[PDB]
């Protein structure tokens, strides 16, 4: 479970 | 360089092509051709060029990754010796990644971040500005890591500091910038509590604003909403 | 050339280090530079020069059917005229994708082919100028044509007959130029009824052999068996 | 639902 970053 | 004999118009519309291929290295070289062009960026050139960016340095730090893991294992107590060639080739992927991040930082000095007036495209900017800088921090090991980590922060910084006075709290630039400072707090600057506080902040206020949304504009935001929660479950 | 310098069982290491990275293009140059060194390859090596080429290329593949097929619609009666855009970067694309099979060619002409004595490592190489030949010809318009089909027959037939003679029904490397050639036959020669007969002789023979075998070859060739049965579902 | 071919 990777954390989110935000993607475009 | 190589693209400055192609039109605007059609590196554009080359990106728009290379996005649907999944040739985002290919995309990425066209948005780089269209912002040395000189001209400032739309809206939905400015996704184009983070969308290319993005996928390409998203491969290089998960390779990056995968090496690094398989570096660390070959010096603990009991591993064979190998030889250098997974410091090598850990390092020639480390060298790659940094060399797009000091490409697109490089763009943005020259000459985007200057020309952009309006909050939504200054705040884009320095939120680009933040995650090169973060990419080249998750790799910096030496004794410049504490002033790249200190740039990634400044970039947030002054990203959050526009968006909180120009851009309501359910703005998607606004929210997208939250999620990645935050993460930038969990995992780069050790500050985990930072983190989880910018997180719930965040989200909370963008929930009081959702009444004032369209359904389009209340999909977007919540979206985003969705991965900050999703972090604040994962580290709590 | 590049990979001149470094040591072939470093650049083995490497390429496996590339494969789990999923660094395919570093894998190629790793193997390229491997083959260049101009001793044979082990059954592992051939394995990993395939895997690096097929990934290369199969991502150039795919890239190409989606711009063929924006071409294709952008052609049709109604359609807005664009521009040059789309078939210049179809042709980048696809000159690009020429070159890594020219590459993978001429690394089985100079000198794989004719050093590879044992039926297994020759059947492997003349498969693989087979699938080159037949990635050309998946592109080819033009007065060539013909030719690029009948070099991709060619080594498909001289595999197909030392595989007869030399291997047994059940070998994974017959039963994969088999499913290959099947689908030359299906999609580049215009002989449907050629590549049903061949799949279904191939597995029905390979069926026959089955038993002969320990568990772990067992499973090895029913697998690629299931693969011409999908074939044989999908075409009747 | 496309075509198999061998993937090493
Ligand atoms: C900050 C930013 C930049 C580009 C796109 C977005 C966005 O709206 N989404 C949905 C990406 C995930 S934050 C945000
Ligand atoms: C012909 C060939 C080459 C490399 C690998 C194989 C193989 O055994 N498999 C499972 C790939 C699918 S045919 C075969
Ligand atoms: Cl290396
Ligand atoms: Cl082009
Ligand atoms: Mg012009
Ligand atoms: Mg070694
Ligand atoms: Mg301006
Ligand atoms: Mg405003
Ligand atoms: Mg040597
Ligand atoms: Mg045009
Ligand atoms: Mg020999
Ligand atoms: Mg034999």
Redesign the interface.
Known sequence: ?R?????? | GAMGSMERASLIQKAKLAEQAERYEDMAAFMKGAVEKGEELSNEERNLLSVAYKNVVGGQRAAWRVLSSIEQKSNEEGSEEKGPEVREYREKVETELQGVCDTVLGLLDSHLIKEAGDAESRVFYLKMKGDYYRYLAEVATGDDKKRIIDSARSAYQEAMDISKKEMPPTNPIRLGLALNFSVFHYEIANSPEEAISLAKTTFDEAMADLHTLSEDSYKDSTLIMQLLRDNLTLWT
Chains 1, 4 share one sequence.
């Open positions: 479970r954390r989110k970053s935000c993607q475009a």
